[PDB]
């Protein structure tokens, strides 16, 4: 039965971990997956989290089945983080959140839903975009197309190509955006550009689909959401797939949410009923651990205080590594100008390296980056900064 | 976009818990969801588990993503559980396991796989069977045919019918089997019957898919594995979806696995690489908490010796509840003869109640049972045994 199966090609992102986790070279450098690292070079369990985790221990009396849509405070907390502690969607009971296995569980369930209970046929992902976006949407059945985004020559958002491209979109089509910290470009639209698009959408009849993974890594928790909230005020319906993987450092405990907004309480209610039906024949219900962690903190004033300190420390570090990168790079006499790198935001950097360069970097020097030239600034350390910069300059 | 979606019908199983909670009848009893209860009517968290959890608290240093397929001890330990310590599948390296969210997640990753990489067109699920089986398979896109199992009047396994119905099963079809504790009948085939069914499939050309979720609730860890192992001995290709939800009291953690066996180490390895691509476009990688726990309980001698006693207690307690139930039923005036109930295995008994009786019990008396007449014995306690038997009795 399986004699004919064919091997699948390594995950461009995930796979790198293996290759890296196998070369027995003293000073290698993994700059591949998007996980935060500290000055010493490791992803520590955040402190607020360890705290929540003790509380769980001491206070948990049961492991009984969560509902299909998980814990309800988790859902509730998620919505204010998204929309506002005030907002209308909350206030008229327009949204319904389902706890899910990370951002990817959210993306996928939105896809099972759309594909089975609506009339969507295509989805519009940017160019570039996270490699797995395509895989997921295709699994559900939907056809993906691409819109124009980045201007590789200038290192800016090519708005007018972005717009024209989309003009190929049809009313009733899905158009996925990244709420902030564009991946892999790190270039986000401006609040006016967000408003514009928000309006255009509304006229062309598009169904917005936000992929929100880095809330708090660009400017702040609340201001990171302006685009999303810009759309929220104009739209009648929208789905949102958030993730607390990168902002709570809960990577492995798989924590995120799928937020369904619709015209009115009765409507979203009816739509949610199927969305559950879709969770039911996938993973059944959600894993408690992380969503319990997250909730505990989000509902405790002290804990939340500590957690919000941790986040800004992460953010700030990275901001330091990006200045220190172009600098050393400069002092190591790199050919080109790498100044744009300072202008991008989030963990990564769209380096500008070609396929062969990034390949060589690896064999030659054991410095791991994604094929596309996507580098992980958060894996950069003052201690690995010099050798890394030598590698880079030498293949350039 | 969403204005026409219709409301989905409630889960027959997971849907009861809604109503039960939402019910205000003081003396209500709940016999719905297959969740274990203790003398006091609480689903507690195992000692060994709590113990394992302390450890993780003190010893865990990172949240960094696990791999697509999870934690390697985990898969290692589960293959020993399944096939036995010195197994040949283990020695010839024919198996490959992936950590999944729950057993359902196991089920679904198998369907997604088979459907996308093989030429499977349909699967054969028992009659009756767990009601979610159909839905997961339909989601993958497969077609579900029913075989003949249970013999209503005699409350016995109808081998003849089983055998002749399966006779419509093409070579290349999938045939789901319940390793032990047949949900919802509690009737399992004998070791010979297992042996007979193992030959036909081999003769017939089917792919076995095993739902293994109650390992240890029938006779014992190893004893419960016999049928599987009987099948593993002659099969070149197999699939096993096992769960850690019942025997570890980890319900909301989502622990399970999808074990892929093949002909040789190179074939299985190839086939798995596709499986790993299926997982990737679904939830991405699995939840570390609950798999960690299990991996710890099974790898540490003491922690394991304890766990094994906990399971023994669960199993027996239920056994004690079956005898009491038919008993009380009898000297409380039961028309029918319910003793067949003593000869079933696991948490449930297939009462033989009419949809209308179950509907009534619920409405008149406050007693929650699935609409097929499936009752959760494990939820039965000596302090509820009486009002329960009285309710039933009045509807007969
Ligand atoms: C990491 C990432 C995801 C996946 O989120 P997980 O919670 O890790 O599954 C989705 N989208 C973007 C843009 C990401 O960076
Ligand atoms: C409980 C059960 C399942 C669901 O298992 P989870 O680990 O809860 O996802 C699947 N199949 C059968 C036969 C079950 O009894």
UniProtKB/Swiss-Prot annotation, chains A, B:
<comment type="subunit">
    <text>Homodimer.</text>
</comment>
<dbReference type="GO" id="GO:0004838">
    <property type="term" value="F:L-tyrosine-2-oxoglutarate transaminase activity"/>
</dbReference>
<dbReference type="GO" id="GO:0009094">
    <property type="term" value="P:L-phenylalanine biosynthetic process"/>
</dbReference>
<feature type="binding site">
    <location>
        <position position="183"/>
    </location>
    <ligand>
        <name>L-aspartate</name>
    </ligand>
</feature>
<dbReference type="InterPro" id="IPR004838">
    <property type="entry name" value="NHTrfase_class1_PyrdxlP-BS"/>
</dbReference>
<dbReference type="InterPro" id="IPR015421">
    <property type="entry name" value="PyrdxlP-dep_Trfase_major"/>
</dbReference>
<dbReference type="GO" id="GO:0030170">
    <property type="term" value="F:pyridoxal phosphate binding"/>
</dbReference>
<dbReference type="InterPro" id="IPR004839">
    <property type="entry name" value="Aminotransferase_I/II_large"/>
</dbReference>
<comment type="similarity">
    <text>Belongs to the class-I pyridoxal-phosphate-dependent aminotransferase family.</text>
</comment>
<keyword id="KW-0663">Pyridoxal phosphate</keyword>
<dbReference type="Pfam" id="PF00155">
    <property type="entry name" value="Aminotran_1_2"/>
</dbReference>
<dbReference type="InterPro" id="IPR015422">
    <property type="entry name" value="PyrdxlP-dep_Trfase_small"/>
</dbReference>
<keyword id="KW-0808">Transferase</keyword>
<keyword id="KW-0963">Cytoplasm</keyword>
<keyword id="KW-0032">Aminotransferase</keyword>
<feature type="binding site">
    <location>
        <position position="34"/>
    </location>
    <ligand>
        <name>L-aspartate</name>
    </ligand>
</feature>
<dbReference type="GO" id="GO:0005737">
    <property type="term" value="C:cytoplasm"/>
</dbReference>
<dbReference type="GO" id="GO:0004069">
    <property type="term" value="F:L-aspartate:2-oxoglutarate aminotransferase activity"/>
</dbReference>
<dbReference type="GO" id="GO:0033585">
    <property type="term" value="P:L-phenylalanine biosynthetic process from chorismate via phenylpyruvate"/>
</dbReference>
<feature type="binding site">
    <location>
        <position position="374"/>
    </location>
    <ligand>
        <name>L-aspartate</name>
    </ligand>
</feature>
<dbReference type="GO" id="GO:0042802">
    <property type="term" value="F:identical protein binding"/>
</dbReference>
<dbReference type="GO" id="GO:0042803">
    <property type="term" value="F:protein homodimerization activity"/>
</dbReference>
<feature type="binding site">
    <location>
        <position position="130"/>
    </location>
    <ligand>
        <name>L-aspartate</name>
    </ligand>
</feature>
<dbReference type="InterPro" id="IPR015424">
    <property type="entry name" value="PyrdxlP-dep_Trfase"/>
</dbReference>
<dbReference type="GO" id="GO:0005829">
    <property type="term" value="C:cytosol"/>
</dbReference>
<dbReference type="InterPro" id="IPR000796">
    <property type="entry name" value="Asp_trans"/>
</dbReference>
<feature type="modified residue" description="N6-(pyridoxal phosphate)lysine">
    <location>
        <position position="246"/>
    </location>
</feature>
<protein>
    <recommendedName>
        <fullName>Aspartate aminotransferase</fullName>
        <ecNumber>2.6.1.1</ecNumber>
    </recommendedName>
</protein>
